[PDB]
Each structure stands twice: as C-alpha cells, then as structure tokens.
Symmetry: D2
Subunit: 423 residues, 4 copies
Amino acid sequence: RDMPLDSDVFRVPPGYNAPQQVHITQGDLVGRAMIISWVTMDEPGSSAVRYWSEKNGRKRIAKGKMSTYRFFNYSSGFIHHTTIRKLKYNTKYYYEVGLRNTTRRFSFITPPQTGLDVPYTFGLIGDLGQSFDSNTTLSHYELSPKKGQTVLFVGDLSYADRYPNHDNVRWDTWGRFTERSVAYQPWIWTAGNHEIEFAPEINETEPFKPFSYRYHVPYEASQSTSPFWYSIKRASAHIIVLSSYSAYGRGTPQYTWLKKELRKVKRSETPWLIVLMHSPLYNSYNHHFMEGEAMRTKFEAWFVKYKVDVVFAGHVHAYERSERVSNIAYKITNGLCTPVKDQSAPVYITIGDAGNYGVIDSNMIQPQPEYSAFREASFGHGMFDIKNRTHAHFSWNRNQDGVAVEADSVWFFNRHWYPVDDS
Amino acid sequence: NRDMPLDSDVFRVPPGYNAPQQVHITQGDLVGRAMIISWVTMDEPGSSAVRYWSEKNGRKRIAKGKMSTYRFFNYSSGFIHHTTIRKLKYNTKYYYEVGLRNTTRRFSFITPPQTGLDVPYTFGLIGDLGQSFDSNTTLSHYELSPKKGQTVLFVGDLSYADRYPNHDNVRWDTWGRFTERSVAYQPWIWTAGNHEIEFAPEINETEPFKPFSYRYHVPYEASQSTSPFWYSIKRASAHIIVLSSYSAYGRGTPQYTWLKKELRKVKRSETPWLIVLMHSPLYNSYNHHFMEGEAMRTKFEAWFVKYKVDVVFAGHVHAYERSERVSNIAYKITNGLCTPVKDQSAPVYITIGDAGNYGVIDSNMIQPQPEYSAFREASFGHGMFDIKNRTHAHFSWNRNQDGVAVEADSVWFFNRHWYPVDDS
Amino acid sequence: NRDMPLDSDVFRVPPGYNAPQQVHITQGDLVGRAMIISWVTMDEPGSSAVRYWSEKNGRKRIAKGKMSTYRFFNYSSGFIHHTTIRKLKYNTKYYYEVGLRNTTRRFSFITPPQTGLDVPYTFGLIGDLGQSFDSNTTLSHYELSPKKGQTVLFVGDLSYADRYPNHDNVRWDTWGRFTERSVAYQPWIWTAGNHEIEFAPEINETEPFKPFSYRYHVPYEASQSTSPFWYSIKRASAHIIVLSSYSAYGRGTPQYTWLKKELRKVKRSETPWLIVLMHSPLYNSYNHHFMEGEAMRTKFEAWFVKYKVDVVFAGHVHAYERSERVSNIAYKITNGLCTPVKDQSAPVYITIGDAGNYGVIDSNMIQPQPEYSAFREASFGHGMFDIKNRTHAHFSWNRNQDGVAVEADSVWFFNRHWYPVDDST
Amino acid sequence: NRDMPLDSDVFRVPPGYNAPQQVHITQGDLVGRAMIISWVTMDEPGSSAVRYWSEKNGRKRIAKGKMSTYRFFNYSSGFIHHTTIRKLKYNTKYYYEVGLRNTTRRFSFITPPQTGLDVPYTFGLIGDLGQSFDSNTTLSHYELSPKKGQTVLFVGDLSYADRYPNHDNVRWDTWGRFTERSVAYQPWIWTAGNHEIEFAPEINETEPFKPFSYRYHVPYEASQSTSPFWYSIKRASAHIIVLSSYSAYGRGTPQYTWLKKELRKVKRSETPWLIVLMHSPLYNSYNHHFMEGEAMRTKFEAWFVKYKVDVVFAGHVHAYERSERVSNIAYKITNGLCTPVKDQSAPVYITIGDAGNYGVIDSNMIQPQPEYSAFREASFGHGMFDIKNRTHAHFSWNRNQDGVAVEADSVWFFNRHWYPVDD
Ligand SMILES: *[C@@H]1O[C@H](CO)[C@@H](O[C@@H]2O[C@H](CO)[C@@H](O[C@@H]3O[C@H](CO[C@H]4O[C@H](CO)[C@@H](O)[C@H](O)[C@@H]4O)[C@@H](O)[C@H](O[C@H]4O[C@H](CO)[C@@H](O)[C@H](O)[C@@H]4O)[C@@H]3O)[C@H](O)[C@H]2NC(C)=O)[C@H](O[C@@H]2O[C@@H](C)[C@@H](O)[C@@H](O)[C@@H]2O)[C@H]1NC(C)=O
Ligand SMILES: *[C@@H]1O[C@H](CO)[C@@H](O[C@@H]2O[C@H](CO)[C@@H](O[C@@H]3O[C@H](CO)[C@@H](O)[C@H](O)[C@@H]3O)[C@H](O)[C@H]2NC(C)=O)[C@H](O[C@@H]2O[C@@H](C)[C@@H](O)[C@@H](O)[C@@H]2O)[C@H]1NC(C)=O
Ligand SMILES: *[C@@H]1O[C@H](CO)[C@@H](O[C@@H]2O[C@H](CO)[C@@H](O[C@@H]3O[C@H](CO)[C@@H](O)[C@H](O)[C@@H]3O)[C@H](O)[C@H]2NC(C)=O)[C@H](O[C@@H]2O[C@@H](C)[C@@H](O)[C@@H](O)[C@@H]2O)[C@H]1NC(C)=O
Ligand SMILES: *[C@@H]1O[C@H](CO)[C@@H](O[C@@H]2O[C@H](CO)[C@@H](O)[C@H](O)[C@H]2NC(C)=O)[C@H](O[C@@H]2O[C@@H](C)[C@@H](O)[C@@H](O)[C@@H]2O)[C@H]1NC(C)=O
Ligand SMILES: *[C@@H]1O[C@H](CO)[C@@H](O[C@@H]2O[C@H](CO)[C@@H](O)[C@H](O)[C@H]2NC(C)=O)[C@H](O[C@@H]2O[C@@H](C)[C@@H](O)[C@@H](O)[C@@H]2O)[C@H]1NC(C)=O
Ligand SMILES: CCC/C=C\CC/C=C\C=C\CO[C@@H](c1cccc2ccccc12)P(=O)(O)O
Ligand SMILES: *[C@@H]1O[C@H](CO)[C@@H](O)[C@H](O)[C@H]1NC(C)=O
Ligand SMILES: *[C@@H]1O[C@H](CO)[C@@H](O)[C@H](O)[C@H]1NC(C)=O
Ligand SMILES: *[C@@H]1O[C@H](CO)[C@@H](O)[C@H](O)[C@H]1NC(C)=O
Ligand SMILES: *[C@@H]1O[C@H](CO)[C@@H](O)[C@H](O)[C@H]1NC(C)=O
Ligand SMILES: [Fe+3]
Ligand SMILES: [Fe+3]
Ligand SMILES: [Fe+3]
Ligand SMILES: [Fe+3]
Ligand code: NA
Ligand code: NA
Ligand code: NA
Ligand code: NA
Ligand code: NA
Ligand SMILES: [Zn+2]
Ligand SMILES: [Zn+2]
Ligand SMILES: [Zn+2]
Ligand SMILES: [Zn+2]
C-alpha cells in the first residue's frame, strides 16, 4: 500500500541541481531562529540561504554546512543545514535555496514572543510513512479550519527500513512528499523505533544514522549533549522531547538532562508543559502492550511532580486518550500497582495513526481499563489548540470524515493555572 | 575518606626505565583460547609486543598489539597497550613478558580447560572494589582463599576515581597498580558500573565510559556485540553474559537486539551454567538504590526465567544479599498481580557489591525481610561460585571480619537445565 | 578525442551479481613472497577474502583484506578491496579467486624466483598508457611479445581521467577493466605521474593523488618509507627504486631522507641491477616538457652517479628516447661547467612515455640531436628490460607500427657493478 | 651549547592560576583588518575568548576561538588557543585581554594603515633566531632600534627545539615565552624552515611540521592557498609572498599552481613593494648549504624576474649576504649560458639568517667573492626594511657587537616598478 515511485507527491523539482526535500524546524530555544535543510542531487552546490521579511525587504545571507552519508550500497545526495538567526517575532519571512544554479523560494511565519497567554495551534502527527493513508492524513491536516502553525512529530518518519537493505531512496521520496507542509512551517522531530536502523547483518551499526544526517534539531540550545533529547519553547508552550530508544538509567545523559530541564520550566512564562516520546507510557492496545513500562518507572513520578499537562506518543497504529492517572505508589511489597485518578497528572494521548504503510492496530485489551478515556483504530491526526493560560482544546480528526469533523474532542484545563477535573 | 593514601605500598611504581605497570589480562576470544594482555608505560610509548611461551612446549613467540592515549579535562594518560595472544592450548600454563624494549616484567597465567559439560571451575565474585583499606582486605581474602578462584567475575564500579576533583584520573592509575597483584595472573571479566560513566559536561567531558573503555578492553566482537559494554564469553562449563545497566535497552536498541539473539545461541549441552552479570540489581531490599533495577527487570526478567538462567550477579548496593528463586512476570497494569512469587524456574539474584568502595557499607534494610530475600547482611566481603559438574555448583560468601577459610553464607546450586530440584 | 568509447569491448562489465571487476595485483613485500590483490565490486560491499592455492600442491587458503570508498566532487565510487597474501613460495604458480560471496572469478600468477645474483627476469616498460586505441595496441603488443614479460614497470600517468569534466572518475573504472587482462595475472609496479595529482580546488578537491592512492596500493612500509608515493622493491636480481616527481624532495624532506638511507642499503652483491623509476625525465631533448626534470636532477643526479645506478626510466614525454651514459654534476654557479659529459659511472636515461595516452605523440624535437642523446623517435610503443645474468641485460623498444617480434632499438647493458665497461652504441 | 638555561629570566612563567603564556599575534586577513591572537594555558583548558577594544572609543567586544592539543613522543602539549579578531579599524591602537576565566593578561597592538601606493612602513627582518644568548641580544637590538620596526618578517628556524633529545618540545614552550615580549605587541609573519620539519620516523613522528603548525597559525585561506606553509598578505604598501622550501614545488603541485596564479594577482599601483620570503636562499656564496637552493631556483627565478620582485629574503645560512641584481635564467642545457648577469628586473637576494640560532656563525665563505655577491659578513644581527614611499625603501643591517643605532651595511632600494634605477 506504499505509494509507487512515480506518484505525483514524489515528483522531482526541475532544473539542474534544484534543491529538493526542503524542511525547516525551530533553530533556537525561544523562536527567533530556524534551521533550513534541503538536498541537492546533481552536485554539492552552495549551503547559503537568502532570506528577508515582508516588513524590511532587506535581504541577508546565512551560510551553513554540507554533509553526505553512505548506507550499505546506497550513497546519499548532498545534505545542507543552515540556521538563520536573530529573526523578529510574529513576522513573515521569505527564504531561497539553490543559489548557484536553480533557486527555489519558500516562506515561514515566526511565532509570537513567549508569554503566559499567547495562543497557538499545534498539529499532532505520528507514524506517518508514505502510503496512500499517509497522503490523506497530510491533506486533512493541511485543510484543517483550525490552521495548524507547527507540527509536533512523535516519531517514525519514512518506514524506509521495511525495504530491502533499508532502501534509502525511500527516505528521499518521503523528503519530497512532506515538503509541501514542512518547508513552510516547522515540524518538531522525535526519534522512533523505525529511525534506529540497527542492521549488523549489513554492517550498519550506527543507531539513528540516516535520520540524524537528514533531520537536525536545536539540541544544544537546551544544553543537551545529543540530538535525540532536547526542549524548545514556542508561544506559551514548553516542549520536552525524549528518546525511548536511548539510555535513561539513573546517571546517564538523558536522565541527568531531563531532571535538570524540568527545574528550568517556568509556568508563568510558558504554562503549557508538553512532553513527546515515541513509545506510550499508557496503552491499552495489544500491539506493543507494556513496552513503555521501563521509561514509565523512571519518569512518570517526575511528570506528576512537575504537573505536566499532556504526553503525546505514537508507535501504536491507533488513537487513544487516557484519563488523568498516575501509577507511582508501588514499592514491591505494598501491592499498590493499580493506576488511580490524579489531578496533578498529565493526560496520555496515543496518536501514531497517520498511515504508516497502510495498517491499523485494531486489537484491544478487553475490557477497556478505567485509565482509558477513548480509543479507536482509525487513521487520522490531532490538533492541540491553545486559547490561553487556562484552556487548550484538543481534537482528533479521522480520515474517513470531513476535514472539519471531530470524532473526539476535549478541553484541557491547565494543571498549574486551572487544575479542574477535565474528564 | 578511607581511601589509601598515594604513598601506600600497593601503589608503588615498578622500578626501572619505562617499566610496564598496571598489568592486567582478560579472556580475548569466545571460548578461552585467547588472552587480552594490557599494561601502561609512563616514560615513553614503548613496544606493544608480548613475548610468551607455554610450560609444555617452551617455544618463545611474539604478538604485536596497539598503543593508545587519552585526555580527560587537564589529565593526560600514559601509553596504554592492548595485545591479544591467540591460538593458546587449553589447560596449560603460559608465561608472558611485557616491556620488551627497556624494562621487562614477567608474569604467568593458566588457560581454562575446553568448554564441556562436567568441567569444574572456580569463579571469584567481586563488586564495587574501590581502593580503600577495606578494598585491600577483600583482595587479600580472595587471593588467600583455600577455594582458589581461577577467574574473577567483576560486577562494576572499579576505581571510584570519579569521586575526586575533576575525576582525578591519577586514581585510575593507582587502582591499576593495586589490582595488578591479582589481575596480571588471572583474568577478570569486566562489567561497567555507574562509577564508570564519568558524564561530566561541566568540564566538557560528555563521552560516557571514556576512561574505563580506554583502560579495560573486552572481546565483544567474538559474540557479535557491537559495543564493549555488553558481550558474552564461555569458559569451562559456563556461558557468561555481561550487560550494561547504563546503556539503552529499549526494544529495538543494540543491547536489546543482541541479548535476544544471544540467549537463543546458548547451548546448555556444552556450557550447562548460564550466568548473567550486570551492575544494578533487579532484586534488592536495602534502602540504598531501592528499585533502581525496576526498569531493566520489566524488560529482561521474563527472558531470564524462560531460558532458565541459573544465577544473576549484581553490585551497586554496598552489601551482600541472596534472593530466593522468585519471579514477578505476571503483571498486566490492572490485574493486581505485582508481588514476587516462588518460581523454581527462575535464577537466584545475588548482590555482591561489598568488596570495599571508599570504606562505607550500606546497612539500612527494609524490614521485615521480604519473602523473596533469603539472606542479607551488611558486611564487607567477596563471593565464590564453584562449579563441580553439570548438576552442582557451590556458592559461598566470605566476610572480611572472619578467617580466610570461614564461609558465613553458603548454598548448593542445582542446575536449572540439568537438575531442577528445589534448592531452597 | 581518440579515447575509446564507453561501450568498447575492453570496457565490458564482468557478468553476474556483484561480480568483481578492475582486478589487479602488485608485489606486496620487499623480496617477492607476497602479492596485493585489488578489485572493485559495484553492487554491494561483498567480501574482502581471497581464496588461493598453489598449482602443484593445492591446499586452499583464505586471506582477508579491507574495503574502502571515496567521493570526488559528485562521483561516488564503488567498493574497493585490497588484500595481501603473504608467505608464498618462490617460482610457483598460484591460483586465486575473488568475489567469494556471490560471483566468483578466478585468476593466477607466478611468484618470482628467490633474489639472487644471476636470476634471469624480464620486465616490460610502459608509460603514459591512457585508454586510446593506441593504448590498446601497445598492451596487445606487450602481451604478445616473444620475450614474455613477467612484470610491468609503469612510469606514471595511468587513466588520464583528469582530462574529463570534473575528472569524470568513471574513466578510472573503465581503465581498470581494460588493463585487467594483463595486471590481474602479473604485477605492475606503480609510479605516480602528474595526471594522478588531481589537484582541483575549483571543485573543492584539494588532496593530491586521492583517486590514484585509493585504487592502487603499494608495499611502501616494507622499505621503511612513510608514503606510498616513494618506495623500493627487490625482485629476482633487480633492486627497484620508485620516486615521486610531484612530492617534496628538498634537503630534510621525507622523500629526500628516504632515498638517502635507501641507497646505502643497496647491496649489488645480492641484487646486481639497480633500477630507478620516476615520472618526469632528468634528460630530455624533446620540446614538450623540456627541462622540467632540472630541479630533481640538481638534487639527485650526483647520488645516481655515486651509486652507479644502471638505468633510470621515465615517462611524461609522449615519445621514446635513450641517452648516453652522461653526467652534469660539476656546476658551481660561476665555474662555467654546465655541459653534460660522458661518464661511464652514470646511468642510462630512457624516456618511454609513448604507450598511447589519449592518442597524441610528441614529435617536436630540439635540433640537432644533442650529444647526450643516443637515440630518439616519436612513435607509440613499449620497452623490455631483459635480465640474463649479473653482467648482461638486453633492452629493446617495440613500435606499435611493427610486428610484435621486431625491435626498432636494442642495446646490451653491461652491469655497472659487475661488468663496468663502456657499453655505448 | 650556548642555549639559555631553563631558569633564565626570559623563560619565567606568568604568575597566577592558568595564566596565559606564549602569547603571539599575526595578521588575520589579506589586507590588514584582522589579527590572529594565540596563547597557551598550562593548568586547564580555559576559554578561547579574547576581549578587545580600541583606545579611542572603547566599546568592549568578545571574539571566540578554538582550543587544540598535540603529543610528540613522550611530550604532551598544553592547551593551545587561536582566535581571530576581525573588522578592525585601520591605523588604530587596540587593547586585548586573554585568560578571561581565571587569570587575565592585557596587551596591545596597532593595526596598519590601509593598503595604498605610498603608505610608509618599517619591517624588521629576523631569521634563525633560536634561544641562545646571541638570540636574546638580537631581539634586544631589534626592540631598541631607533628605526622602530612595526612588523617582523621571520624567515624560518624558530626554536631549534629539534636539536634536543626527542626534540624536547619543552624548548618550544620556552621559546614561546621568550619571544612574547615582542610578538604579543606586533605581528610576526611566519615562514617554515628546516628545523620546523621535525620528521623523526625513528620515534614515529612522521607528520612534517606538526608542532610548528599547531603552535603558529597563518591566514592562509585568505589568499586561496590550501596549505599554511605557502600564503601571501598585504600590509601598507607591500605585497608579501611566503613560500615553503621543504614542500613540493614541481609543475602541477599545489604550491607551484598557487604561486603562478598569485603573481597574476599582484597590483603594483596598490602595493608597489613585492617581497618574497623563503627559508633556503636562492643566491648564497657561503660554504654551508651551498647550492641547496638550486632546485627551487630552476622553477621560480624566471617568474621573480618576470614580475619584477623587489627583494627576496631568506635564512638557513647563519650569516649575512646581499646580492647584486642578477639573473641566471637563460640556460638551455646545450647553449652554455650558465653564468649570472646584471638584470635590472631581478630582485636583490638577501640572506638574513644570523639572529643567533644556538650560538654558531657560518664563517666559511667561497673565495674569491663572486660577482653576484655585493656584500657579505659572518656576524650576528638583524635587518630592517624601511619603506619611505612608492619609489624608495631603505634597508640596513645592525650587528650585535655595535650600538643599537649603527648600520654596518646600508643601501637604498629603488622600486622595480615605479623607479627602476640601477642600485
Ligand atoms: C556432581 O557434583 C556433586 C557435588 O560434588 C556430587 O555430589 C556429591 O557426591 C559425592 C559422592 O561422589 C557425595 O560424597 C559422598 O558422601 C557419602 C555420604 O556421606 C554422608 O553419609 C556418610 C555415611 O554413609 C557419612 O559418613 C558422611 O560424613 C556424610 O554425612 C560418603 O559416604 C562418601 O564417602 C565415602 O565414599 C567415597 C566414595 O567411594 C570414598 O572415597 C570414601 O572413602 C568414603 O568411604 C562421599 O564423600 C557428596 O555428598 C555429594 N554432594 C552433594 C552436595 O550432594 C555429584 O555426585 C552425584 O550426586 C550425588 C547426589 C550422589 O548421587 C552421588 O552418588 C553421585 O555420584 C556429582 N555428580 C556426578 C554424576 O558425579
Ligand atoms: C651472461 O649473459 C650474456 C648474454 O646472454 C652471455 O653472453 C652470451 O653468451 C652466449 C653463449 O652462452 C652467446 O651466444 C652464442 O654465440 C656464439 C657465437 O656467435 C654461437 O656460436 C652460439 O651458438 C651462441 O648463440 C651470446 O652471443 C652472448 N651474448 C653477448 C651479448 O655477448 C654470457 O655468456 C658469457 O659471455 C659470452 C660473451 C660467451 O663468452 C659465453 O660463453 C660466456 O659464458 C652470460 N654469462 C655467463 C657466465 O654465462
Ligand atoms: C588540574 O586542575 C586541578 C584543578 O584546578 C588542579 O588542582 C589544583 O591545583 C592548584 C595548583 O595550581 C591548587 O591551588 C593551590 O593550592 C595550594 C595548596 O593549598 C595553595 O597553596 C595555592 O595558593 C593554590 O590555591 C588547587 O587547590 C588544586 N585544586 C584541586 C581541586 O585539587 C591540578 O593541579 C594538580 O594538583 C594540585 C593539587 C597541584 O599538585 C598542582 O600543582 C597539580 O598539577 C591540575 N592538574 C594538572 C595536571 O594540570
Ligand atoms: C481562555 O479561553 C477560554 C476558551 O475560549 C475562555 O472560556 C470561554 O469564555 C467565553 C466567554 O468568555 C465563553 O462563552 C465560553 O463558553 C468559554 N469556554 C469554556 C470552555 O469555558 C476563558 O474565559 C475565562 O474562563 C471561563 C471559565 C469564563 O469564566 C470566562 O468568562 C473567562 O473570561 C479564557 N480565559 C481567560 C483567562 O482569558
Ligand atoms: C620617497 O622618499 C625618498 C627618501 O626620502 C625621497 O628622496 C629624498 O627626498 C628628499 C627631499 O625631501 C631629499 O632631501 C633626499 O636627499 C632624498 N633621498 C634620497 C635617498 O634620494 C623621495 O623624494 C623624491 O625622489 C628623489 C629621487 C628626489 O627627486 C626628491 O626630490 C623627490 O621628491 C620620495 N619620493 C616621492 C615620490 O615622494
Ligand atoms: C543515586 C544517583 C547518583 C547520585 C550521585 C553519584 C555518586 C557519587 C559518589 C559516590 C557514591 C557512592 O557510591 C554509590 C552511590 C552511587 C550513586 C549515588 C549514591 C548516592 C548515595 C550513596 C551512594 C551512592 P554506588 O554507585 O557505588 O553503588
Ligand atoms: C495526494 O493528495 C493530494 C491532495 O489531496 C492529491 O492532489 C494527490 O493526487 C494525492 N496523490 C496520491 C498519489 O494519492
Ligand atoms: C621523555 O623521555 C626522556 C628520555 O629518556 C626522559 O629523560 C624524559 O624525562 C621524558 N619526559 C617525559 C615528560 O616523559
Ligand atoms: C594490603 O594488603 C597486603 C596483603 O595483605 C599487605 O601486605 C599490605 O601491607 C596492605 N597495604 C595496605 C596499605 O593496607
Ligand atoms: C614506530 O616507528 C618505529 C620506528 O622504527 C617502529 O619501530 C615502530 O614499530 C613504529 N610503530 C608502529 C608502525 O606502530
Ligand atoms: Fe510506527
Ligand atoms: Fe558502588
Ligand atoms: Fe602523460
Ligand atoms: Fe638555521
Ligand atoms: Na537505573
Ligand atoms: Na610455547
Ligand atoms: Na521499549
Ligand atoms: Na616538475
Ligand atoms: Na635547503
Ligand atoms: Zn514505532
Ligand atoms: Zn554503583
Ligand atoms: Zn606526465
Ligand atoms: Zn635552516
């Protein structure tokens, strides 16, 4: 059910060495920078980006870096990453890539300065892939009347590793497929299990290597030492990105980094505290049941202590929304191992249902446990619409429905500013 | 601070120009016919060649290895040598010499017998050794033990150098000179503890395990691991699996992938004793680090029960603990089944992190003793796991405050694959 | 453009999934007991293992090598294998196979005799081969020669890939497949010429010799050299020194220092024939590249006369020339002694860069012929240096326009150490 | 052995925890608007940031650089810093501070005037300095010169550390601390000499120039060179070309290709003084190293005469010599033209390698003095190249055994392009 190589979403931009696979993401901690990325195939080309605002018209030049990789018998094109900085808040910019031979032009809109009551709309996509179901989801997100401004991506991008020798041409087609969205607004990248690409059978043993070459993130801005975990702030949201498939024992980099990062969170500057990871801590589907238990034993209590608002995960090819629960009182011999209602706790949302290679996960644990509010095996995407410091509106759109229909929808009440029960 | 001062006898430098120091050895292949020979020269790079011969044939041979150096903050290492001797005869005494160019030092070892069903072998068990005065006593009790251990299973936390300002790596060098009087003559099987992480971004040192990994090499490619921090070796009648508590082990990760495949390769008709080393215990009823093992346990415990692992050795708690054979693999979030139960199909869990560290014992325990815990005591000591044949092994625990020959705890193991009768 | 087109037969891809191509061997040690097996696989990395066994005995062994890859501008290479077979027996035919995982191909070679005073041996001389039609004829003439070459001495300028846009490295791949029919069966000894430099900052390739050095390894550590671009080998009764015209050679440089110590190690009582290979000729009365060899001459000529080198072979000039034994080492800036004189202690200097290149011959000569030049002609062809015993070696030049058994020029060398007698024509 | 012992005053270590030592500066760009600031910290890495401000305005700014280390045999370097200050103002005195994190130290320099046809400027000429007692005298004589030199052209052989056992690299550190009293306040232009090669395969140091290149950076990319060992700069009314006696220079090599194109760039109406620096002299009538420079001469002498180089400076020979204006470029093997002739498009060749090395002079001279030799003497000292304007520059030679204001040799240079009078 994967879209064939000659499909229109995979068409190659014309002209000698025309930039392709253009994508952007937030380039700094607070919103005043952007990482511009693209691939040229005919020759290395230039790493310069030319950009200007609608307001100023003044054209400046940023210069970045070019890298390549091989994977088994595949040889990549020339990958460019360039960071434009010191931009102005709430402003439309133009930028151009391919300055040596074939120039292409795009644009983006910076976010507002971070603040307590700054509204903002986030799209939620996981496990996208490049099947036909993938294409419908992206169309539905594009036509959403709520107008997403940034995508939080919860992992599993191209599913290129399902192909023989992980055929990396399928990374390239995915790069051209998603451009019509991610060249114009930032997507925030989370690493999933399909990015690992651990294949000693063909002497490819560097974890995450193709993903890490193609998708860069601003991980030093939060003083992280790896791209696989980091945070950013945008409008009124503090977003914490975690890596299910890196080390998180006591004393490791990721564990040490998270414990320090939660202490920097300021709820009167960014009241919406959002965590992303690939593998769900709370999951009542049969597929991948209880895989999140390990990370859950390390981090769940931290999430409650700091009153995290919501945790988004993918990995399960379906949709689920948890009640506000915690399961943090167990001590081996006390028998306290059942989740309980907890108004300091986040809501757990699984949203890894954007299409993958065309398969849904429909088997569920019966009966639905108390901790599960809503679950359904349908393709689609989510929208997390922040109105202000007390209220945010979440809605789930199905591919079989109209682009304006919401099959699930709920108001989030802020854990710090308005911790009402929101069942 | 009960650390031995820098001018202690155990820290003396071997005299002579560019005299090799910190000499240590470990198994260098899958099945016992190779040895990794390691040492440090401090005056100049020197030769990485090892001269060696068997007592049986007396033919001097030469093996060439590699030299490396590292830096950590404002410390610069000496010249680190690693050399693999190969194609050794089983059950044979060998001599070896390092420092062939200026000052030469000679040592010896004995290869194991070939892997087989009823091949006896005595493994020492040492965890969280350190370089305090208690560490020296433990080491003396081991080398003086009438059971005579042939190989040390080391469950992590080596030098404790990371407790010093800037992780003063001089305390790695001292520890190497202290342990030489044992590890130069018999292999130690290295596990990576949390004191080896040395993650210190405040001084721009962000590569985990860097000092440990430059100084202590392991034969990880022989079991097709891709990392020195998990791997497998076979010796006599044992299959030893080494794990990394502070690497990734999520489903799909390198370590998870390797362990799933490796348990399937275990041939209990060749090595009947399946033994797992890791730093952080899965079962532990002391207050200190209580439940830090929960994460790894949810990932790997059902596998250990499935493949009838005989015993799991851990450290990290500074004390001794021996569990019953228990499991806790029936939990399903909402079914309330979360109390360990007796399970004669499960390994024994032993904590043996009490060789000395920096002079501090972990004496606070959860009371009353839980049903899963068989024996526990807060005393310094070491362990011995003495294989007799395919069905019987004998474990003993020796306390620093007893005579070298006094066993304070001891128990017979009945092999989970060849003889699974209640040994509780 | 007289370069052979891409679909020529000499460029045909060996059939079969991941079949090895561009197979070539060279001597892999100082004395002749080793051989470096090199080849490229185009579909996936494959195995670096070489299976090999001797024709008479036949116990099959495996040797394991290494694989590497490189990029040049927007060209990406396939998978390059280099594998050293050691501890061979002298004067023995060996079989060997490559491609052990998927498509295997089998070849063979004959180890040299053990080094010794009177060991006969036959060396081909080829320079500036390229891949034109003229190139094909010369290689044809060499492989058909009655004298039966057992090793090619190659004085530099291999593929001429750098004449193509962006140095189209595909033209390295074809040249490998074209030369395979000789170099997979007998070692070629490699010298680095000015077309291997491939210095092209305009496309950000600033590492001299990158494609050449990835594809052709040499046993350079065996003579205590620190660079592949200069080294020494012994083979039968010859001691061969390979130098680098386009590397440093000032006093105190690595190459200078290495040649100095290497000339001391030469023992003419063990290997009587002392042979030097370099790309740019020290003595050259053709007009193309006239006097480029002067800088290296001022450094090394006196050393050649001192050590009584028998012969110096060079290329670069797309024609043939053979000098008289002469020297020019008495100049002191103001004493006026700047003319070459006859010197029975000096080597013969032979330019042999006429194997074909891209089809052009250098016919502009300085006139009249200088007294330092014995014979010269602007024709394509190749040479043979045919060693008989410790006193006699026969050099001959075969033209492409002649029968393969015809020598258009031919001279008997009398050994400078064992028969130090005037041997001029 | 007349080298200064380790406890000499000139080798004292700046006091205080991790105080910068071995501070040295050089030109950081092509035209004079930038400066490379270099120093060593011995107790811990420290910061590579430099603080600098003009004496005029005084707006303080920070430039960030790069720390590196090396090993040589059993030696382990300290922490070496290189930091480029850019966009400086012409003809302006600046202050700079290094060591910001712990012990700070403060120095100053004066940027040159803008390049131009008639800018005056005074260059000191020092060669083969080393660290003998004679070395200390020459550096005193240069510092005290009434001519007041503003930038040193250093023609190679720096520390002579390679004469010690295993090239005791401590002797680089001592030399660094000794020369600091001049080179921290005004730039020195580095040329590589044979004592910088440090090729010692018998202790597996086989990378040519390794300690030298770590310790002394040059702005080589600003002239499109691919190597630090050949490069060019412009300062005031001079165009300075630095060449590498012990790198490759055959036809088609990188340095050959660079020099050929670089000479095509010189413009004598912007910079009328065309100066070439190299270590091994092309004209030398002393016995030590006689005719060592023939090889480079066969490749480059004709180019020097074709582009009318004013003066060529070299060292290597521990003495002084000034040549007549001659060339020896007509030789064609059989035509017999091998004697040098007066040539008024040729440069003057000056050997200035007599600053002290380790205390030995080269006194054995070829007799009688050849015609191409104007003046020669075997005594320690230094030179001065004092440019008055586009037609005139004045060269003088000061000997260590004279007062700091006596010139034992002296001559006017008439510019080859603007005023080619027989001199
Ligand atoms: C695999 O290893 C295990 C561990 O070593 C083996 O188990 C041991 O087996 C040995 C026998 O080989 C046992 O030792 C023997 O014990 C008997 C009984 O001792 C008790 O009762 C005596 C009165 O009869 C009393 O005097 C004594 O103090 C004790 O309380 C001894 O009688 C015996 O000594 C006499 O016989 C030997 C043999 O000829 C003579 O040499 C002596 O001179 C004496 O006259 C001997 O010491 C030992 O108890 C076992 N250990 C354990 C922990 O069970 C195992 O052996 C196998 O399994 C055991 C369970 C038995 O079935 C053995 O028969 C059997 O071989 C090893 N497996 C194999 C296949 O070998
Ligand atoms: C070393 O190698 C040289 C070159 O091959 C030998 O010289 C050659 O010796 C051949 C005899 O072995 C000569 O061939 C004969 O010529 C005669 C007269 O024309 C014929 O009747 C006869 O049938 C052969 O064809 C050959 O001419 C000669 N070549 C040269 C260039 O001189 C040399 O042999 C030694 O020197 C020569 C001059 C003779 O005296 C030989 O007998 C003598 O042994 C070889 N050296 C040794 C020690 O064998
Ligand atoms: C690596 O960096 C550490 C941390 O700075 C160095 O240790 C420090 O050395 C300083 C000496 O420069 C000490 O400061 C002095 O302490 C003495 C003793 O009280 C006082 O009299 C004096 O006035 C200074 O304050 C500093 O206390 C010390 N800090 C720590 C945490 O140990 C280390 O230096 C090495 O160790 C010290 C103890 C001395 O022996 C040094 O000379 C020695 O090199 C640095 N190591 C290296 C190899 O550079
Ligand atoms: C934050 O946004 C919320 C959603 O837009 C606001 O609540 C909405 O307020 C409307 C008129 O103020 C009312 O008609 C809507 O029904 C209501 N929606 C919901 C889900 O309550 C909210 O306004 C404040 O909070 C609510 C609870 C009322 O008390 C309003 O009168 C308040 O002004 C916004 N909060 C703030 C602080 O702006
Ligand atoms: C460039 O500087 C030269 C050195 O000072 C000038 O020559 C000097 O001019 C002085 C007049 O101010 C005169 O007294 C000095 O004797 C003379 N010095 C020498 C060594 O000749 C030079 O001046 C021009 O050129 C010379 C040849 C004379 O014709 C002067 O009168 C000229 O002004 C300066 N050149 C220029 C273009 O300014
Ligand atoms: C618990 C997370 C890490 C916090 C600090 C790191 C350890 C710093 C110094 C050494 C302490 C003693 O060592 C033990 C230990 C290790 C780790 C922590 C402890 C805390 C208290 C006592 C002993 C703790 P251990 O790892 O050897 O079993
Ligand atoms: C993908 O979706 C877009 C927009 O809905 C549509 O125009 C395009 O034809 C689709 N392509 C495929 C291959 O489904
Ligand atoms: C280096 O080696 C020399 C030669 O023996 C020795 O004298 C010197 O002290 C050594 N220095 C260091 C820093 O190891
Ligand atoms: C350590 O133990 C050994 C052996 O028991 C003893 O000889 C030595 O003196 C002890 N040293 C210290 C510092 O305790
Ligand atoms: C280092 O070079 C020396 C010089 O002889 C040599 O003995 C030694 O083996 C070399 N080490 C290598 C190539 O690893
Ligand atoms: Fe998925
Ligand atoms: Fe510990
Ligand atoms: Fe050529
Ligand atoms: Fe000198
Ligand atoms: Na842990
Ligand atoms: Na032996
Ligand atoms: Na997992
Ligand atoms: Na040349
Ligand atoms: Na020289
Ligand atoms: Zn997944
Ligand atoms: Zn621990
Ligand atoms: Zn050429
Ligand atoms: Zn010199």
